[PDB]
Amino acid sequence: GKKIDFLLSVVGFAVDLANVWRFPYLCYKNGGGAFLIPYTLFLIIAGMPLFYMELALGQYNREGAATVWKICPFFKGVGYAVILIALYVGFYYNVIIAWSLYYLFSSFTLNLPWTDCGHTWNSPNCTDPKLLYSKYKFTPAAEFYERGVLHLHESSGIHDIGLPQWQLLLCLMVVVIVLYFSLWKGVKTSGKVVWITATLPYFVLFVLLVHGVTLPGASNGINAYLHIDFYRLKEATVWIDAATQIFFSLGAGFGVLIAFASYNKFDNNCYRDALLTSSINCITSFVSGFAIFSILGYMAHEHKVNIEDVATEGAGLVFILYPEAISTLSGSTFWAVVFFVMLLALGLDSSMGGMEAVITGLADDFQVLKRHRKLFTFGVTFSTFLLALFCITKGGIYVLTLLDTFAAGTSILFAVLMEAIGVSWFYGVDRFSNDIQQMMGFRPGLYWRLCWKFVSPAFLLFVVVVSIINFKPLTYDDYIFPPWANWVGWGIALSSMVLVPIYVIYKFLSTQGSLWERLAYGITPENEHHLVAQRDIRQFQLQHWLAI
Ligand SMILES: CNCCCN1c2ccccc2CCc2ccccc21
Ligand SMILES: CNCCCN1c2ccccc2CCc2ccccc21
Ligand SMILES: [Cl-]
Ligand SMILES: [K+]
Numbered sequence: 001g002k003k004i005d006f007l008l009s010v011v012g013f014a015v016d017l018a019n020v021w022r023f024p025y026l027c028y029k030n031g032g033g034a035f036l037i038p039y040t041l042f043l044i045i046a047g048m049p050l051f052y053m054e055l056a057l058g059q060y061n062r063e064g065a066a067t068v069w070k071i072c073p074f075f076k077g078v079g080y081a082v083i084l085i086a087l088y089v090g091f092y093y094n095v096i097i098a099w100s101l102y103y104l105f106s107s108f109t110l111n112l113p114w115t116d117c118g119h120t121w122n123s124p125n126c127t128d129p130k131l132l133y134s135k136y137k138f139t140p141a142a143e144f145y146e147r148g149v150l151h152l153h154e155s156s157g158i159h160d161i162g163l164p165q166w167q168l169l170l171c172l173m174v175v176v177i178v179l180y181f182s183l184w185k186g187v188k189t190s191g192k193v194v195w196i197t198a199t200l201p202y203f204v205l206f207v208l209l210v211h212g213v214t215l216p217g218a219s220n221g222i223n224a225y226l227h228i229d230f231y232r233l234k235e236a237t238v239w240i241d242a243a244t245q246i247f248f249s250l251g252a253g254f255g256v257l258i259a260f261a262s263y264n265k266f267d268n269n270c271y272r273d274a275l276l277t278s279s280i281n282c283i284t285s286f287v288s289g290f291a292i293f294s295i296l297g298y299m300a301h302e303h304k305v306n307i308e309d310v311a312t313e314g315a316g317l318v319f320i321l322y323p324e325a326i327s328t329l330s331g332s333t334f335w336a337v338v339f340f341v342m343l344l345a346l347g348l349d350s351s352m353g354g355m356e357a358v359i360t361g362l363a364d365d366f367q368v369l370k371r372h373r374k375l376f377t378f379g380v381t382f383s384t385f386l387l388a389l390f391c392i393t394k395g396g397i398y399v400l401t402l403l404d405t406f407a408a409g410t411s412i413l414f415a416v417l418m419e420a421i422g423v424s425w426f427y428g429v430d431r432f433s434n435d436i437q438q439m440m441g442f443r444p445g446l447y448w449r450l451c452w453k454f455v456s457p458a459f460l461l462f463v464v465v466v467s468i469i470n471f472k473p474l475t476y477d478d479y480i481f482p483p484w485a486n487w488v489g490w491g492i493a494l495s496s497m498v499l500v501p502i503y504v505i506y507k508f509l510s511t512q513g514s515l516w517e518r519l520a521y522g523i524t525p526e527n528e529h530h531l532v533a534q535r536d537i538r539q540f541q542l543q544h545w546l547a548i
Helices: 002-014 017-029 033-061 073-106 140-149 166-183 200-213 218-226 230-234 237-250 256-261 270-303 317-327 332-363 367-371 373-389 396-406 410-427 429-440 446-469 483-497 499-510 515-522 542-546
Strands: none
Touching: 002 270, 017 033, 017 073, 017 237, 017 270, 017 317, 017 332, 033 218, 033 230, 033 237, 033 256, 033 270, 033 410, 033 429, 033 446, 073 140, 073 166, 073 317, 073 332, 073 373, 073 396, 073 410, 073 483, 073 499, 073 515, 140 317, 166 332, 166 373, 200 218, 200 270, 200 317, 200 332, 218 270, 230 237, 237 270, 237 410, 237 446, 256 332, 270 317, 270 429, 317 332, 332 367, 332 373, 367 373, 396 483, 410 429, 410 446, 410 483, 429 446, 483 499, 499 515
């Protein structure tokens, strides 16, 4: 029972909405097979060491994202930046959950709305194969998603977003109420119904893959998925996408792993947890991509169109694909209900931890918030609800893609780079290894220390610089955003990227003493401050820097 429960818990925390929603369309947009090489390379090199480092930091220091930086007082800015990024992500994460809830509600019927067109929301240009370079957007499923759910046809761009959709408004209200009621009592919510939610996604994926393999056109989709277009590997768009997807999917760099590890037993094995989580993450992503490409190859065969134009490359790819596969299953209503219930539960569980990260990180900084978890939870949830209500307008898909591109991109890459730089170079990679040994009893291997100190920061810096210099103006299918939209996106990214120097300056000015005294007080652990007067600072000697 001990091992099975641990395996189930790890498996349940891996698969999450990132894996089943964001990876499909990021892989499709990048050609499929060509997206796996950068994905796996970054997975190993950055994700595994950073996941392990965040787990170890949280477990040892027993502090949230903001307060964990008592070891290096200058990086509370990094803590605040990751907290802000976590706050930003929820705005559109909850909107995706609302879409899932809407589809679940719409699935309750014997005639699924996305099977054949002719409804009130269908344009005259519909084309139903059964009844008779553009992304199409004229099939029954695409028409349904883009008109009867988003009502995107009523917006001409990001400058004409319009008023919130009342149906999506109600769905967002329900999602937010569920989140609050599941977050107000405390952080302990597991061990009750995780059994069903820890296995339903994998069963759904298994049946979907088994059915998709045996479809008229799945062979072409699989061939495209496995084919690697090496010309795509030299543009840096695939590399930026892979890095951002790896850090969003693993959960490293959002301040959530630190907060959750703060509650772990002091003897808990972070190495095993990181290894298993990364392995499951990779395997699930690969299988999901396989199934997605099989389904879209079937669609290409059925729609008499090239595989590169069957469905959109935006955030609605899964909501346009999975209904198509479901319609091909016997008793489609039951399968649709099961699939969308699975999606809703998965999203709710993921978003719960995502918001708990911010709640705990901010509470650990001010004790008043910790003493009033209910009111603080309500405030955070209400702010998220309003800023997401901004994203369920008629032109809300444009704002959603703006956020999905600029909220956790270069911002999280810079935050994780600064986390690694701070911890390793300033605190001491040898000190971190000593803490890990004191916790689990064994010291990290040479590979982990090398990744923490040299390999991971180098790759992260390269990715950040390339993303900053190689920037593509935003587009959504055939829509090209106005320049001020790109400026607003970069401002959103900078809002979190810039908290680091601001806090460094603030700490330098607030500190009292001489320049060397200021640096000593800024690069020394708070509980270790009293050695500064004695003037033995390990950060001022070459040995601290050359340690490995
Ligand atoms: C024994 N506790 C740690 C394992 C479960 N734990 C994990 C597992 C993998 C990665 C992160 C975490 C963080 C805390 C958490 C939250 C919910 C379920 C499992 C876990
Ligand atoms: C792990 N992939 C992302 C899953 C959701 N994600 C959320 C959700 C809502 C708000 C913030 C975040 C930040 C990243 C994170 C970390 C841990 C669990 C979920 C999430
Ligand atoms: Cl992923
Ligand atoms: K995941």
